[PDB]
Design a protein around this ligand. Structure first.
Ligand SMILES: Nc1ncnc2c1nc(Cl)n2[C@@H]1O[C@H](CO)[C@@H](O)[C@H]1O
Length: 385
């Protein structure tokens, strides 16, 4: 029953996803708000602790006590130049506890501090409860994914987050490995298979090259930009609409925090519409000083606003190919991961760089990692018996 059941968890920087392999198929489990992905946010309020969508929806009103990006801190030392550089951009306090970073917040009127693994365990507990509500029974066995560049300390801290959350961690697997498993790329029989995983998420870009030799996976190269993702494209849209409001009304909205946030959420939504339509409309009642902002943007204009950012995704692809010592024609499969890979211009650029090659994109890219982890969790729990 419960002891023979296992889940796959994609514990992401900005979003998390949970899957279960049963009756010959993977089911990506929707949360209580009907969403197949849940924000990796934890809010501490005057009465409660919020996780996911409810935490993300109140980030504007409570920025000092809403934690996100815990994956950027997990398994790292306080003195690490990555930690020191990132701290300058977060609205929450990061403190030092014996060369280990802790996030310090106000919760139920008291000052509390949490280790990154305790923050990640609260996200994992939510993913576990989403699976339990769908299954009708508690599930405790899980496969958790990590980026392929995570070292031993980051992997151990992720496993510890799993233990705190009440999960029995069957295995910690690499995100590009879970993605290749989702597409069945490890069941092609004999001979070495070279796979490139192009992972463009909300806040990070990762390129991974894997060799699959008779079921055995090997990471040949990892490249990317830890500070490039979907949120940079939303900000390019925001800047355009701030300048358009200034041309139509002779009023600068940039300093009005509420106006910029409402514009940012509308831009994120418009950006998503632009993946399946050639135009999107913005409908913001009383954006600033009682002025409604009813406008539209074409896909062509959006592609111009982000042109330099889209083109920059090809330098890590080339860098990963030289590090792996492979030419383009030596790559057998191209796999898309992350919601931003739905952008048609991103797909066109990658396909043209690989000389008109077909892309593996039939599995929802923001769900492919949880899908593969769910498949691996089923295989592992069966062998355990
Ligand atoms: N249809 C879409 N067109 C463009 N971007 C998308 C789309 N869906 C998601 Cl999710 N994202 C973005 O992917 C990230 C999460 O993986 C977020 O930045 C989200 O906006």
């Amino acid at each position: 029953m419960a002891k023979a059941a296992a889940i796959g968890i994609d514990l992401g920087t900005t979003y998390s996803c949970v899957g279960v392999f049963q009756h010959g198929k993977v089911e990506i489990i929707a949360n209580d708000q009907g969403n197949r992905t849940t924000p990796s946010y934890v809010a501490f309020t005057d009465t409660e602790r919020l996780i996911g969508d409810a935490a993300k929806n109140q980030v504007a009103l409570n920025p000092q006590n809403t934690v996100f990006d815990a994956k950027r801190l997990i398994g790292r030392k306080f003195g690490d130049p990555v930690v020191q550089s990132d701290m300058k951009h977060w609205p929450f306090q990061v403190i030092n506890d014996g060369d280990k970073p802790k996030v310090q917040v106000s919760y139920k009127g008291e000052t509390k501090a949490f280790y990154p693994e305790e923050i990640s365990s609260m996200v994992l507990t939510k993913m576990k409860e989403i699976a339990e509500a769908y299954l009708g029974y508690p599930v405790t066995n899980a496969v958790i994914t990590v980026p392929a560049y995570f070292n031993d300390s980051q992997r151990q801290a992720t496993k510890d987050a799993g233990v705190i959350a009440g999960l029995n961690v069957l295995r910690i697997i690499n995100e590009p490995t879970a993605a290749a498993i989702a597409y069945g790329l490890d069941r092609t029989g004999k001979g070495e298979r070279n796979v490139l995983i192009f992972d463009l998420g909300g806040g990070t870009f990762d390129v991974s090259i894997l060799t699959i030799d008779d079921g055995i996976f090997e990471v040949k190269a990892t490249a990317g930009d830890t500070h490039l993702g979907g949120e940079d494209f939303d900000n390019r849209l925001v800047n355009h609409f701030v300048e358009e409001f200034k041309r139509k009304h002779k009023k600068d909205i940039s300093q009005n925090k509420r106006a910029v946030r409402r514009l940012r959420t509308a831009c994120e939504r418009a950006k998503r519409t632009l993946s399946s339509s050639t135009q999107a409309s913005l409908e913001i009642d009383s954006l600033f000083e009682g002025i409604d902002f009813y406008t539209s943007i074409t896909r062509a204009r959006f592609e111009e606003l982000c042109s330099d950012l889209f083109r920059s995704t090809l330098e890590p692809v080339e860098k990963a190919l030289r590090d792996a010592k492979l030419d383009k024609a030596q790559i057998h499969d191209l796999v898309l991961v992350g919601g931003s890979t739905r952008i048609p211009k991103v797909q066109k650029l990658l396909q043209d760089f690989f000389n008109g090659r077909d892309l593996n994109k039939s599995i929802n890219p923001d769900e492919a990692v949880a899908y593969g982890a769910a498949v691996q969790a089923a295989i592992l729990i069966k062998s355990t018996r």
